[PDB]
Ligand binder design. Structure first.
Ligand SMILES: C1c2c(-c3nnn[nH]3)n[nH]c2[C@@H]2C[C@H]12
Lengths: 216, 290, 55, 338, 231
């Protein structure tokens, strides 16, 4: 037998529950993206096209996207990376002009291998943005790709070199039956990147729904 | 013999062929044992967390209810159309058969439409329905099934055939009644829904080729398997019944020996409609990686 | 790097120059504290349902 | 030169090791081998708090042993009434990346922080009837890992940058910084007298600090991996640490070395949380295997197992009266045990 | 914090009036609201209650079926629609704030009030109607109830209010022992079920006025006659 004040407290608790459920419903209808990239990888350009954690909001085709940038946080990644388990996708930015600058491409490859094969992101997909393709074309015309990849064999032209970098990054995925890598080539002035991210996210959502209904 | 008989005042004629007592129990026993050993497990463990699990749980419940009453059908057959239990019991048994088949079909269609929305409209709000709404939808659908099939309990179905007692909602009678319209619709309408949903899901999937075909193929194969299983299970009896209605319209029940063959056919095809309930656990639940 | 090494050395000097007791005395003190407050520990001694606010 | 200072440091480390060896005349196990075991502890779940919609990262009891504060990755810091399971408050956070909670020992304020590198202090008792942000303490260059009130105007924080800080709340400034660690500081425990505090770091070391003077008084080693949790023994003369070695260790301040190690061959997962029961006989540890083990603090033996979480137990706490044990997990629930 | 009532005046018997109370300075949507009334020369009488969220409405028996309580949270307004007015309804009406959660202080803030002129419950007894006292002395005011106010959850639901000449009542004690925010420590309260006492130590000026004891154990809320302290 509750007292009057106890009943009023229960009523307030139920109001709190209602508000929490409404907020959860709003949050579930949102796409979460973790933005990673090497220093000067150009992820700032993507953030344009799209002191701790930086949160960027945008919308596209009535779909709300929350992007989280963690590059300003220089600490032990192992202690906060699990916070992003369940993120809808990871956007990884790599600068193609970095092949001949200092082994920067090797640092990017190591970071990509660490993130892609991470135990917290076994089923999380990666949208890979290869930035600065015009500067890459200039430099590859003036400088060889063998500086970064001594075993590279083939035309020292834009197409073959860019494809070589793409496959080099794509073969770091040791779980090819669980997640996907969506690679797009970008530049400073572009308009299709948001559509790329939207299409990849829609594919991921469809695959998740198929998993939920049990068709996989 | 003299097969003409009066059921609820209507001129039918029912046949009693020992082939029905010989062949059907062979299929019905297997259907019962497999339906138990599959659906009892599908109920013990759902397939409760998600709406899809709720709908599959309801499908399994309907299949369980339908199979548990198959031994009584087997008894009616082994004795060559001789019900030993009386009127109210077989009223209830026929009501259970009809209601559980209708519920199983409805929930097959619900699962198909949910898959359609999940694959074709990824960002519809139906994909984010909470368990409560799934429960309310499931309850309303069950209520629809009972409201449609309770006339079986309302009406009489037990009739004395000479030295025997025959219970049956499918006597060949010059009486087209709502039960037959429901019997045809339970195939034609959900079949259309299921085939459309599946075609859109397979069309939408085939437009995207982002290097994961290994499992998308599997999903497409399973959708097609569901569609073909439904068709092969339920189309035969409907086809035989449509032949029966053409005959009734043109040749009324006077020389009704002409129905003798088709009647047997019908009761040899109803068995297939029960067999669906033992396949469904394999198609829907056991295919998942558990 | 000389300043950091000097800081480390000074900290080591401060840490080394402290009074210490035998491990037996510390273990006896821990046992004594545990025994003295045993009757006041509900989790060791389940409280009757009448005196348990979480029933 | 660097070599001379290195040699002197090595000599001092050897001196400290020898001094600690001299004091290790007996083991806690030998002395406690003559006392009866606590027996089998069968604690049952008395409540289940069902508000959060994401992983709960931090819980803190009030000093009345009835109110709780919890924080989840869905923002929504929630203040609970344990006895009735009533939600007293639901505070929205300006950043959902919360990793620590604190409940002032007056009930007037609550603190939380995380990947935003700020410690936010919320006033629970205002004339307007709502919870308001009272202060935002900025100055850490890394993530906030733990925070504990000393009073209404002093709070101690630990950061991903290898530093702890003491903050005046009125001014919003660091009064003293603690700068000895070489890795991320993950946990933080205040002494009962609020004159010392111990911090465990990713450098596999714990450090005893003096709040007023602002210098590392002692350094304790022995763990092989990072230390995630730390707690003071009730008398303030000992503390327990839990690591990713799937091991807990009990250290004594006056003897200045490890006393005991809690480990089992069947446990291979790290420890998320550690706490003591009143009188310190029981040591509760929340692990990554969705479990919480109850150890006898005087005998390494395991007393019980608080099963019932479907994801890893991220935090736990014991009431000031010792009546109940709260455990929160990466499942959205937190349970009360008795 | 400010609650401003309006809409009072002079009405003929059988008429209707809509009193309003504009709220500012606090989260009105988070607070339950009460309408209380005081006759020209009598004590306080509880009228109506509307909860936060508008889920629960309670009325006094003398006004049930006649008065209607409503609230507009976005406009931060509380409305009392009174129909079929009688001479018994002549009184000053106050709007009162009240929030309910563990450790809260309901009935904490009162409005200034507006005057309207028309042309099985628990009985709270304030045995003493007047008490003359000199500054610096200690005073004790007693209150009795028909049934024990101590609930099985440990709370004794007794509230002590002080109404000074020309001012709205202000909360002194809630739940028989808890001193309200902003109240001097001179005041204290104690007692057991059916017998409660408010003790004023070091009586000072501005403690003159009428002290009322109220029960919040069950609805309808009931007040005592009121004990008057004069210097
Ligand atoms: C089976 C059956 C059914 C039926 N309805 N749904 N499934 N079987 N109706 N009447 C009869 C006679 C005894 C056979």
């Amino acid at each position: 037998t509750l007292s009057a004040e106890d009943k009023a407290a229960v009523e307030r608790s139920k109001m709190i529950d209602r508000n929490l459920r409404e907020d959860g419903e709003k949050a579930a209808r949102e796409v979460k993206l973790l933005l990673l990239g090497a220093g000067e990888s150009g992820k700032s350009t993507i953030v344009k096209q799209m002191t701790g954690i930086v949160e960027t909001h945008f919308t596209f085709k009535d779909l709300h996207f929350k992007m989280f940038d963690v590059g300003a946080q220089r600490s032990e990644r192992k202690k906060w990376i699990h916070c992003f388990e369940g993120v809808t996708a990871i956007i990884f930015c790599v600068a193609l002009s970095d092949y001949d600058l200092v082994n920067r491409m090797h640092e990017s490859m190591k970071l990509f291998d660490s993130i892609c094969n991470n135990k917290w992101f076994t089923d999380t997909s990666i949208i890979l943005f290869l930035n600065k393709k015009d500067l890459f074309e200039e430099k590859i015309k003036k400088s060889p790709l063998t500086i970064c990849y001594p075993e590279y064999a083939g035309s020292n032209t834009y197409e073959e070199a860019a494809a070589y970098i793409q496959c080099q990054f794509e073969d770091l995925n040791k779980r090819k039956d669980t997640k996907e890598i969506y690679t797009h080539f970008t530049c400073s002035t572009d308009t299709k990147n948001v559509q790329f991210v939207f299409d990849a996210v829609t594919d991921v959502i469809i695959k998740n729904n198929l998993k939920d209904c049990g068709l996989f | 013999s003299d097969h003409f008989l009066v059921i609820n005042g209507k001129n039918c004629c029912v046949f009693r062929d020992e082939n029905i007592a010989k062949v059907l129990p062979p299929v019905l026993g297997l259907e019962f044992v497999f339906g138990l050993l599959g659906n009892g497990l599908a109920l013990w463990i759902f397939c409760s967390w998600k709406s899809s699990r709720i709908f599959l749980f309801n499908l399994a419940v309907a299949d369980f209810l339908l199979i548990i009453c198959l031994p009584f059908l087997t008894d009616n057959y082994v004795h060559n159309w001789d019900w030993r239990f009386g009127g109210i019991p077989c009223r209830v048994m026929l009501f259970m058969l009809a209601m559980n088949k209708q519920g199983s079909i409805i929930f097959l269609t619900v699962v198909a439409v949910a898959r359609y929305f999940r694959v074709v409209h990824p960002h519809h709000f139906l994909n984010k329905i909470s368990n409560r709404t799934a429960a309310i939808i499931s309850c309303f659908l069950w209520g629809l099934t009972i409201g449609l099939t309770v006339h079986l309990l309302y009406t009489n179905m037990m009739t004395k055939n000479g030295e025997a007692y025959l219970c049956s909602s499918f006597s060949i009678c010059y009486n087209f009644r709502w039960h037959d319209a429901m019997f045809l619709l339970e195939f034609f309408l959900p079949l259309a829904i299921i085939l459309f949903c599946s075609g859109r899901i397979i069309w939408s999937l085939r437009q995207r080729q982002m290097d994961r075909h290994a499992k998308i193929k599997r999903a497409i194969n399973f959708i097609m398997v569901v569609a073909i299983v439904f068709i092969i299970c339920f189309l035969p009896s409907v086809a035989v019944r449509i032949r029966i209605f053409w005959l009734l319209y043109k040749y009324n029940v006077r020389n009704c020996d002409i129905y003798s063959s088709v009647d047997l056919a019908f009761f040899t095809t109803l068995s297939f409609t029960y067999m669906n309930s033992m396949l469904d656990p394999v198609v829907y639940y056991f295919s998942s990686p558990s | 790097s000389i300043a950091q090494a000097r800081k480390l050395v000074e900290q080591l000097k401060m840490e080394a120059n402290i009074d210490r007791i035998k491990v037996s005395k510390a273990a006896a003190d821990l046992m004594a504290y545990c025994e003295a407050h045993a009757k006041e520990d509900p989790l060791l001694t389940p409280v009757p349902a009448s005196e348990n606010p979480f029933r | 030169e660097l070599d001379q200072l290195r040699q002197e440091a090595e000599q001092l480390k050897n001196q400290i090791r020898d001094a600690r060896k001299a004091c290790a005349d007996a083991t806690l196990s030998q002395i406690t081998n003559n006392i009866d075991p606590v027996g089998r502890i069968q604690m049952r779940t008395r409540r289940t708090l069902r508000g959060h919609l994401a992983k709960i990262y931090a819980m803190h009891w009030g000093t009345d042993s009835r109110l709780l504060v919890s924080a989840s990755q869905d923002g929504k810091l929630i203040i609970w009434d344990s006895y009735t399971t009533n939600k007293v408050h639901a505070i929205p956070l300006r950043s959902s990346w919360v990793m620590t909670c604190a409940y002032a020992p007056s009930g007037n304020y609550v603190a939380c922080g995380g990947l935003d590198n700020i410690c936010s202090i919320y006033n629970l008792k205002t004339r307007e009837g709502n919870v308001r942000v009272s202060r935002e303490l900025a100055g850490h260059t890394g993530y906030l890992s733990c925070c504990r009130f000393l009073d209404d105007n002093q709070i101690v924080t630990s950061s991903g940058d290898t530093t702890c800080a003491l903050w005046d709340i009125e001014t919003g400034q660091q009064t003293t910084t603690f700068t000895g660690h070489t890795g991320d500081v993950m946990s933080l425990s205040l002494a009962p007298d609020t004159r010392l505090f111990v911090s465990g770091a990713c450098d596999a070391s714990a450090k005893l600090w003096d709040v007023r003077e602002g210098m590392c008084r002692q350094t304790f080693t022995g763990h092989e991996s990072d230390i995630n949790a730390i707690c003071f023994f009730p008398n303030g003369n000992a503390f327990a640490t839990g690591s990713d070695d799937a091991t807990c260790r009990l250290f004594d301040l006056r003897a200045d070395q490890e006393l005991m190690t809690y480990s089992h061959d069947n446990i291979i997962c790290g420890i998320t949380s550690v706490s003591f029961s009143k009188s310190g006989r029981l040591l509760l540890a929340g692990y990554d295997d969705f479990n919480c083990n109850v150890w006898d603090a005087l005998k390494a033996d395991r007393a019980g197992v608080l099963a019932g979480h479907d994801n890893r137990v991220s935090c736990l706490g014991v009431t000031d009266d010792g009546m109940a044990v709260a455990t929160g997990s990466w499942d959205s629930f937190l349970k009360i045990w008795n | 914090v400010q609650l401003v009532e309006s809409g009072g005046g002079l009405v003929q018997p059988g008429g209707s009036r809509k009193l309003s109370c504009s709220a500012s300075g606090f989260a009105f949507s988070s607070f339950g609201m009460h309408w209380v009334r005081q006759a020209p020369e009598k004590g306080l009488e509880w009228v109506a209650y509307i909860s936060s969220g508008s889920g629960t409405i309670y009325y006094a028996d003398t006004v049930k079926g006649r008065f209607t309580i409503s609230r507009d949270d976005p406009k931060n307004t509380l409305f009392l629609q009174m129909t079929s007015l009688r001479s018994e309804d002549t009184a000053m009406y106050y709007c009162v704030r009240s929030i309910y959660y563990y450790g809260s202080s309901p009935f904490d803030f009162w409005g200034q009030g507006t005057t309207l002129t028309v042309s099985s419950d628990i009985v709270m007894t304030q045995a003493t109607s007047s008490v003359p006292v000199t500054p610096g002395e200690s005073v004790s005011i007693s209150c009795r109830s028909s049934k024990s106010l101590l609930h099985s959850n440990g709370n004794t639901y007794l509230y002590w209010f002080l109404q000074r000449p020309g001012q709205s009542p202000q909360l002194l004690i809630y739940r028989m022992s808890n001193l309200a925010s902003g109240v001097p420590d001179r005041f204290s309260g104690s007692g057991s079920g059916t017998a409660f006492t408010l003790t004023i130590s070091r009586l000072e000026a501005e403690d003159v006025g009428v002290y009322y004891c109220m029960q919040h154990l069950e609805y309808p809320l009931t007040f005592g006659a009121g004990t008057k302290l004069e210097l």
